[PDB]
Amino acid sequence: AVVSLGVFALLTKMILQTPWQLSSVPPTPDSITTIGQHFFSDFLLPFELASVLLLMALIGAVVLARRELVLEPEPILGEEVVPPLELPERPREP
Amino acid sequence: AVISVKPILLAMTPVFILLCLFFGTRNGFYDTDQYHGNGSAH
């Protein structure tokens, strides 16, 4: 509660005293047309990387939440013993 | 009028070399009792 109240009193001192250069022009000339001419001129490579980020977010979030009903008791191989779907460094206390 | 060390070193090199390669072949006790064995100061 001190760091959160500390950041808040820090940011309000920053907000008020900083001179912003606010312009008196009328905004939004149909802001679905000038937001779509940004997706395919300037913000194109963040728009194509948003596709790569979302495909990875579906590959990863499926394999971390799906049920292991394919083979839960699968002793695949061995040099020394490893449990299924676990990293082989077994826990051990010195 | 000083004895130079170069003719006394160059004439002492090939006797030092030929004597190590002979005296390596001749040794005793470091192969038969030798209870130090492997670990050389244990």
């Binding site: 509660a1 907000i15 008020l16 912003w20 606010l22 312009s23 940004h38 913000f43 977010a57 499926v62 | -």
Partner: protein, 101 residues
């Protein structure tokens, strides 16, 4: 409502998200408290776009990508909690301190 009052709204909406990020004991309430931080950087961002650079909005484009990241970070983010709940049958952030030192 001017530009200044949106920022102090965004700076206050950030710090309730911070207080939930550190104090909350449910593993899911930390994820909702993360989403408050990713709205305060949106409320700052559109408010910087309306009063500054109003003709070509570079902020409302940048406001779109924050929603899609945080929607993809909460889709990943709950997959992790749902992998823990199948192993450790509780969600308690004072129970995940087994990698101590």
């Amino acid at each position: 409502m001017q530009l200044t009052y949106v920022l102090i709204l965004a700076a206050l909406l950030f710090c309730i998200g911070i207080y939930g990020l550190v104090t909350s004991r449910n593993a899911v309430r930390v994820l909702m408290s993360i989403e408050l931080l990713l709205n305060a950087v949106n409320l700052n961002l559109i408010g910087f776009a309306n009063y500054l650079d109003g003709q070509q909005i570079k902020g409302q484009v940048f406001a779109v990508f924050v929603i899609t990241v945080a929607a993809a970070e909460a889709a990943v983010g709950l997959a992790i909690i749902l992998a823990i709940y199948r192993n450790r049958d509780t969600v308690d952030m004072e129970k995940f301190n087994l990698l101590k030192w």
